[PDB]
Design a protein around this ligand. Structure first.
Ligand SMILES: CN1C(=O)[C@H](Cc2ccccc2)O[C@@H](c2ccc(Cl)cc2)[C@H]1c1ccc(Cl)cc1
Length: 85
């Protein structure tokens, strides 16, 4: 499943080295994750928790925080920022 990220997500992916306009979900998650890890949006004590308030990611996802353990929720928010090819 190749997807085409909407402007805002494309901007975040490319901010961590992404170069294409089209990607597989695994590549999206990889860059999305390198973005979180690079910025250190996660909590040191509760490392599965992400704080993205006032961030590009918070804008993207529409939430102030989320847990990486909630896969369906993460998939939902990501899907809202891409069109499936
Ligand atoms: C599946 N996956 C990844 O591919 C990347 C891996 C990565 C880490 C560092 C540098 C490059 C690539 O991120 C994973 C991950 C990110 C953040 C947290 Cl808090 C936990 C796992 C994890 C992940 C990516 C995105 C999201 Cl929203 C949740 C988890």
């Amino acid at each position: 499943t190749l997807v085409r990220p909407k402007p805002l997500l494309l901007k975040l992916l490319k901010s961590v080295g992404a170069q294409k306009d089209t990607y597989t979900m695994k590549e999206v998650l990889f860059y999305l994750g390198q973005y979180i890890m690079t910025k250190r949006l996660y909590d040191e004590k509760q490392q599965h928790i992400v704080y993205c308030s006032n961030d590009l990611l918070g804008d993207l996802f529409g939430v102030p925080s989320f847990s990486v353990k909630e896969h369906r929720k993460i998939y939902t928010m990501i899907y809202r920022n891409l069109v499936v090819v």
